[PDB]
Design a protein around this nucleic acid. Structure first.
Ligand SMILES: [Mg+2]
Ligand SMILES: [Zn+2]
Ligand SMILES: [Zn+2]
Lengths: 65, 49, 56, 299, 56, 232, 49
RNA sequence: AUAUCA
């Protein structure tokens, strides 16, 4: 839930890259592997951060108060 | 990491690896013991309690 | 054994009553009070006794 | 307890339960070492063990306030049991058994509360009112089904559970003047707002109507617009005013039916209140459909 | 002097008299002057022998 | 510092005999001395929690300031020209140096052969600045003047550091000084100890003095609670 | 310095389980006693022995 | 009393 700032393994900021990744997929139709790489996420530790994220926050927002 | 133990990247732990939230819930009733005796919600004073 | 165990002593005529330590009571909140199962079982023995005494 | 070394009048002492000690907070002298867990100790009397496997479970809780101190087990079937000896030892308990049987009048109160939808705190007050007045010479020879019908309104009038006397007249039984005198000799030893929730529910009105009727009725009394009419009538009348003011209306016949009042009587209170309808309503009431203060029936 | 909170510290002082001094609360936990024969209930320290066991 | 002591008393009439006895027993005649003590307590107007930075309980206590005064400040005109010796007692910019002391209630223990009190002391030598009066300085520490008393007496130096004081105490107030010791003298025997040995040795010295005066004047251990300056 | 061995390295899905040391750790040295037997009470919960 | 832990 909610994109991790910084990759656990090396600590490369990954907090900014979320919307940008989600955009390179809808708007650019691009496959996951290219979008990640476009965003400069080269090490698999960094790749796994975005590639395997589950943004549960968006469901959480669906409840009123 | 011998005999089923493991080593964790303390650096990763700081970055949020495996952290979790924890919520415990405590309950309490204000019970009524018959015609007169009733428990009360209040801050007890140490002289009369 | 003539001193410590005559056969006449197997049949109960008098009943040793154990003290509270063996059957503790607890006084909760004036409308709640807990007695030990033995204290219950004793009271039945007594009630049954008092009854049979009156009958004889 | 008071520290033998210090002795200050407010004896400031702590129960360090975790180390199982009772300490004097001032000098630090330990005043006691044997210390017992009362929660877990109470778990031995009132547990969840109904099967019989717990070795900790060794006693049972009783109620010295209601049934005095009558310790008594019951001969019943166990795992290895012949159905013969149970009968004999039970037929033998029959010869040893009057007032130890009038406790089945608690079963009359319990079956009346559950038929009247009454809480667990009301039964225990009705059972304590009945135990302390059923053998009185002040009640002497009152209708025995009307003295327990009076001790239920005595238990409701302390547990804050709104129950009119006509609500208990419907249960059992009640002879009105007979359980009305009995409700006073024991007493020596409702309002508009009470009915509004139920009547409204049966009426099928919205919260908005209920609240306004509730506000009007109180104001009616506050205003003293209805000199001595029964609260039930006042409430039914107020419900009429508010409801008529809103969209979903209810007629006198329908209100009276629910309130168990008569239209004529509701009319009586209603007209008395109507003159001050303006003062009566909640301030942010929204009259709807076509029913403003001017337009209300006025009947 | 170290007391119950510091590591190499102590919890109680047992006088000849038999009564236990709780260093956590005693107003005299500071100015506590020991006497031969008293007992200091001190923390477990490096190199104390202890029984270690794994059940069964 | 650890002060081991024993106390006693005598009425004015017992003076000469006691002086004569202590003079023979110690080998020296008495030495006249005085001291002014001012006691201070935490300002009641200010209030602070009673705990450490480590959140450990701290008990509020009084601070005692003590110094001497030239004898001439204690002799009026009626007192004029009277041998300045032991017999006189019968007819009864910056700050100066002071002794600052905070003491603890004596050590606990049933059947104590002597009183044993811990004393934290430091010395004030001088001051400077805006508010340099000892009074301001005490206030700066967060304390206020509570009370003060004058003590006049004679002392005897004995073996092993044992000291004996025969004293008279007067509380000082504008309303007047009242003699706390009215009637006689407060007798004090003590030794100041900066190892268990020297402590048991010191006890012995005091015990031998008590033993040597048994029958004549009795020296005992005062009540701990009477030697506790904590505020409460 | 390079390791003489080459390590099998890659991501693996690891789970965090309900058993954490701090909810387990327990120590006692004189404490609450039962009423009947006058022996140490039961369980970490009750500060048992 | 069920669930669970090695
Ligand atoms: Mg294992
Ligand atoms: Zn990375
Ligand atoms: Zn105390």
């Amino acid at each position: 839930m909610i994109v991790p700032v910084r990759c656990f393994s090396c600590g490369k900021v990954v907090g900014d890259k979320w919307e940008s990744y989600l955009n390179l997929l809808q708007e650019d139709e691009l496959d996951e592997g290219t979008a990640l790489s476009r965003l400069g996420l080269k090490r698999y530790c960094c790749r796994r951060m975005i590639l395997t994220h589950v943004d549960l926050i968006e469901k959480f927002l669906r409840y009123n108060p | 990491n011998q005999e089923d133990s493991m080593i964790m990247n303390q650096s990763s732990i700081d970055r949020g690896l495996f952290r979790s939230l924890f919520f415990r819930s405590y309950m309490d009733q204000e019970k009524k013991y018959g015609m007169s005796i009733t428990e009360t919600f209040e801050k007890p004073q140490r002289t009369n309690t | 054994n003539e001193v410590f165990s005559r056969p006449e002593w197997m049949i109960l005529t008098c009943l040793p009553v154990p003290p509270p330590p063996v059957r503790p009571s607890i006084s909760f909140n004036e409308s709640q009070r807990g007695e030990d199962d033995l204290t219950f079982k004793l009271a039945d023995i007594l009630k049954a006794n008092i009854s049979l005494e009156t009958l004889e | 307890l008071t520290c033998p070394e210090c002795k200050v009048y407010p004896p400031k002492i702590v129960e360090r339960f975790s180390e199982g000690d009772v300490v004097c907070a001032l000098c630090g002298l330990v005043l006691s070492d044997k210390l017992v867990d009362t929660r877990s100790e109470w778990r031995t009397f009132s547990n969840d063990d109904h099967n019989g496997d717990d070795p900790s479970r060794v006693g049972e809780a009783s109620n010295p306030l209601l049934d005095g101190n009558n310790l008594s087990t019951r001969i019943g079937k166990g795992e290895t049991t012949d159905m013969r000896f149970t009968k004999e030892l039970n037929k033998a308990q029959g010869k040893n058994v009057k007032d130890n049987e009038v406790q089945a009048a608690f079963a009359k109160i319990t079956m009346l509360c559950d038929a009247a939808e009454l809480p667990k705190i009301v039964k225990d007050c009705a059972k304590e009112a009945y135990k302390l007045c059923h053998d009185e010479k002040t009640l002497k020879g009152k209708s025995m089904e009307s003295i327990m019908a009076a001790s239920i309104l005595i238990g409701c009038r302390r547990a804050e559970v709104a129950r009119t006397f006509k609500e208990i007249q419907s249960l059992i039984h009640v002879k009105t003047k007979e359980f009305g005198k009995t409700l006073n000799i024991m007493k020596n030893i409702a309002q508009n707002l009470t009915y509004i929730p139920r009547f409204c529910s049966h009426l099928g009105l919205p919260m908005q109507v209920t609240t306004s009727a509730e506000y009007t009725a109180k104001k009616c009394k506050e205003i003293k617009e209805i000199a001595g009419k029964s609260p039930i009538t006042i409430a039914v009348v107020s419900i009429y005013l508010n409801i008529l003011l809103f969209q979903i209306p209810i007629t006198a016949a329908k209100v009276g039916q629910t309130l168990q009042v008569t239209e004529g009587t509701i009319k009586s209170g209603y007209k008395i209140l109507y003159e001050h309808r303006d003062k009566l309503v909640d301030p942010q009431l929204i009259a709807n459909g076509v029913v403003s203060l001017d337009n209300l029936p006025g009947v | 002097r170290n007391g119950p909170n510091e590591h190499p510290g102590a919890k109680y002082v047992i006088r000849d008299s038999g009564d236990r001094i709780d260093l956590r609360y005693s107003k005299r936990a500071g100015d506590i002057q020991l006497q031969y024969g008293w007992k200091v209930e001190r923390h477990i320290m490096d190199n104390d022998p202890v029984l270690f066991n794994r059940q069964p | 510092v650890q002060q081991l002591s024993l106390f006693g008393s005598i009425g004015d009439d017992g003076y000469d005999l006691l002086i004569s006895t202590l003079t023979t027993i110690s080998g020296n005649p008495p030495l006249l001395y005085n001291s002014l003590c001012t006691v201070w307590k935490p300002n009641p107007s200010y209030d602070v929690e009673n705990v450490n930075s480590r959140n450990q309980l701290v008990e509020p206590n009084r601070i005692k300031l003590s110094k001497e005064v030239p004898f001439s400040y204690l002799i009026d005109e009626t007192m004029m020209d009277k041998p300045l010796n032991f017999r006189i007692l019968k007819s009864f910019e910056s700050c100066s140096p002071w002794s600052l002391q905070i003491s603890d209630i004596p050590a606990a223990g049933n059947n104590r052969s002597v009183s044993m009190q811990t004393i934290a002391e430091t010395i004030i030598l001088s001051s400077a600045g805006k508010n340099s009066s000892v009074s301001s300085l005490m206030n700066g520490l967060g304390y206020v003047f509570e009370f003060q008393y004058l003590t006049i007496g004679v002392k005897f130096f004995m073996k092993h550091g044992l000291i004996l004081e025969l004293q008279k105490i007067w509380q000082i107030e504008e309303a007047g000084n009242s003699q706390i010791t009215s009637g006689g003298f407060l007798l004090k025997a003590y030794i100041n100890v900066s190892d268990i040995d020297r402590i048991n040795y010191t006890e012995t010295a005091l015990m031998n003095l008590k033993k040597e005066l048994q029958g004549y004047i009795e020296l005992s251990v005062p009540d701990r609670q009477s030697m506790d300056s904590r505020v409460a | 310095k390079k390791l003489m061995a080459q390590i099998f390295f890659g991501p693996t899905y690891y789970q965090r389980l309900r058993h954490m040391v701090d909810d387990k750790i327990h120590a006692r040295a004189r404490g609450p006693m039962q009423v009947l037997t006058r022996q140490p009470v039961e369980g970490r919960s009750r500060d048992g022995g």
